[PDB]
C-alpha cells in the first residue's frame, strides 16, 4: 500500500486535478479535457527539483507540501508514479513518457538529470525551437514512439521558443472486467450540442453495474469496473444534451462520494462512443493561475538547478493523452442474462457530452479526470 507521504500527495494531486479541470472547463475554447493527476503533480515536482528561490517554493505550495522536506516530495511522487504504472492490471494499457526539451545552447546539470530520471523517469533533449519543422517532428515522433503511434501529434506549433518545454505523452486504454462483444457496434449520431451532431461508432453491452439516476438533478452515473476490479471508470452524464457547466459545478470530492454511496447494483444497457480521443493541453497558463507564476515568467524564473543557462523558464507543460474506448475486456459467464435481475435493464446511452473519472480501487487514487465533448468524426447532415 502507499506510504503516508505518497497517500497525502495522491489526495493533493486529485485536488489539484479537480482545480485544473474546473479552470479549463471555464475556458470556452477548450472542448475535450483529459488530466492524469500524478502527471500534473510530477510536472510541479520537476519544477521544484530544477528550481531555486520562490520558483521552487511556489511549486511546493501548489502541492501543499511545504511541511514535507524537498526529498520527501520527490520520493512521495516517485512512489505514486511507480505504484500506478504497476498496480493497474496487466491487461489495462497505460503508456507514459516525460521529456524536458531545452534550447540547443543549454547543458542540463548531472545532478538534475540523475534525480529527474530516478524519481520522474524524465528524459532530456536539446532542440532548436525556431526551426519549427524539425522541432515539431522531434516532439511528435517522440510522443508517437512513446504511445506506439496512438498519440501521433502533441502540438501543431511551439508558441514560446526561448525556454524549456516539458512534454508528457500518454496512452490509456481501459480493459473492461466484462468485455463488450466486438460485433455489437453500429453507427449513431453523437450530439455535441442540441444543433451539432457528429457520426460515431457506438459499442453496446448489458451487465450488472453500480448505478444511480438522480431525477432531481437530471443526471446518471455509472461505474464500469476495469480488469480484475483493481480500477474503475465512472461516467457522469446529464439526462439530455446540455453544456456540462451545471454538472461540473456540482461535481466536487464530497459530492462524488455521495453519488458513489447512492449507487446500487442494477442491470444497465450501456452504449459508448468507440474510438481513440486525442486530447492535448498546454497547462502553462493554468498552472500560473493556481500559484506557479515565477517559473512561467521569462524574467522572474529561477531554473538554475536544471541548467546554469539563467533566463531559462517553463515555456510549456504539454499534457498529451490518447484515450481509447474499445470493446476489449475479460470474458464472463453469459448465464447471467437468464437471471431475474436482468429482465429489465436501465439505459446509459452516452450519445452526448459526459464527464468521466478513472479511480484505482486499491488506494482510492484518481488516475484520470476528463470529459468527452467532441469525439472524432464528421458533422452529420441529412436534409440540406
Amino acid at each position: 500500500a502507499l506510504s503516508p507521504k505518497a497517500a497525502t500527495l495522491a489526495e493533493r494531486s486529485a485536488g489539484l486535478a479537480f482545480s485544473l479541470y474546473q479552470a479549463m472547463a471555464k475556458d470556452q475554447a477548450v472542448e475535450n479535457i483529459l488530466l492524469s493527476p500524478v502527471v500534473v503533480a510530477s510536472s510541479l515536482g520537476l519544477v521544484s527539483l530544477g528550481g531555486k528561490a520562490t520558483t521552487a517554493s511556489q511549486a511546493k505550495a501548489v502541492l501543499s507540501a511545504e511541511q514535507l522536506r524537498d526529498e520527501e516530495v520527490h520520493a512521495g511522487l516517485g512512489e505514486l508514479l511507480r505504484s500506478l504504472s504497476n498496480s493497474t492490471a496487466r491487461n489495462v494499457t497505460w503508456k507514459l513518457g516525460s521529456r524536458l526539451y531545452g534550447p540547443s545552447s543549454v547543458s542540463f546539470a548531472e545532478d538534475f538529470v540523475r534525480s529527474s530520471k530516478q524519481h520522474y523517469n524524465c528524459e532530456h533533449s536539446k532542440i532548436n525551437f525556431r526551426d519549427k519543422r524539425s522541432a515539431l517532428q522531434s516532439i511528435n515522433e517522440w510522443a508517437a514512439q512513446t504511445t506506439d503511434g496512438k498519440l501521433p501529434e502533441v502540438t501543431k506549433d511551439v508558441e514560446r521558443t526561448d525556454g524549456a518545454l516539458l512534454v508528457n505523452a500518454m496512452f490509456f486504454k481501459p480493459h473492461w472486467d466484462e468485455k463488450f462483444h466486438h460485433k455489437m457496434v453500429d453507427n449513431r449520431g453523437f450530439m455535441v450540442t442540441r444543433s451539432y451532431t457528429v457520426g460515431v461508432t457506438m459499442m453496446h453491452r448489458t451487465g450488472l453495474y453500480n448505478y444511480y439516476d438522480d431525477e432531481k438533478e437530471k443526471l446518471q452515473i455509472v461505474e464500469m469496473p476495469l480488469a480484475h476490479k483493481l480500477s474503475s471508470l465512472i461516467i457522469l452524464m446529464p439526462h439530455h444534451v446540455e453544456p456540462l457547466e451545471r454538472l461540473e459545478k456540482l461535481l466536487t470530492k464530497e459530492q462524488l462520494k455521495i453519488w458513489m454511496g447512492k449507487m446500487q447494483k442494477k442491470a444497465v444497457a450501456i452504449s459508448l462512443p468507440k474510438g481513440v480521443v486525442e486530447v492535448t493541453h498546454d497547462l502553462q497558463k493554468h498552472l500560473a493561475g493556481l500559484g506557479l507564476t515565477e517559473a512561467i515568467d521569462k524574467n522572474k524564473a529561477d531554473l538554475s538547478r536544471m541548467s546554469g543557462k539563467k533566463d531559462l523558464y517553463l515555456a510549456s507543460v504539454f499534457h498529451a493523452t490518447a484515450f481509447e474506448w474499445d470493446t476489449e475486456g475479460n470474458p464472463f459467464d453469459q448465464d447471467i442474462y437468464g437471471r431475474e435481475e436482468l429482465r429489465s435493464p436501465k439505459l446509459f446511452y452516452a450519445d452526448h457530452p459526459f464527464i468521466f473519472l478513472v479511480r484505482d480501487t486499491q488506494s482510492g487514487s484518481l488516475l484520470f479526470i476528463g470529459r468527452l465533448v467532441r469525439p472524432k468524426g464528421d458533422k452529420m447532415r441529412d436534409e440540406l
Binding site: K183, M184, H204, T206, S271, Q334, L342, L347
Partner: protein, 106 residues
C-alpha cells in the same frame, strides 16, 4: 433519463390491403424490430413479424379495406452477443390507422 422506445412511428403510404410504415431507432443496439398489428378494439390476437435492426421501414400486407388497425413497434435489444437468443424488448410505440376503402386509381 431517456426512454428505451422507438420514435416517430408513422404510415408513409397506404393501400386498401397494405401499409408502408417508418420509425426512428430507439437508443441501444437493435437486432430486430418486432412489428405487431391487429384490428383496433377487436379481441382477436395481434399478428406479428420482425424486420432486421438495420431497417427503419416495413410493409404490413394482407389487410382489409376501411378497417381501423393498431400498429405497434418494439426493438429487440441483445444483452451481449448480437447473434444470441438472449434479448430484452424496448417499450412499444403505437399508432392507429384506417386502411383506405379504394385504391387511388380505378
Amino acid at each position: 433519463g431517456v426512454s428505451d422506445v422507438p420514435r416517430d412511428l408513422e404510415v408513409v403510404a397506404a393501400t386498401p390491403t397494405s401499409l408502408l410504415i417508418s420509425w426512428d431507432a430507439p437508443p441501444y443496439y437493435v437486432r430486430y424490430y418486432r412489428i405487431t398489428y391487429g384490428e383496433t378494439g377487436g379481441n382477436s390476437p395481434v399478428q406479428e413479424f420482425t424486420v432486421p435492426g438495420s431497417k427503419s421501414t416495413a410493409t404490413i400486407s394482407g389487410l382489409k379495406p376501411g378497417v381501423d388497425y393498431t400498429i405497434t413497434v418494439y426493438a429487440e435489444h441483445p444483452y451481449y452477443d448480437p447473434s444470441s437468443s438472449y434479448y430484452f424488448s424496448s417499450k412499444p410505440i403505437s399508432i392507429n390507422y384506417r386502411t383506405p376503402h379504394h385504391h387511388h386509381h380505378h
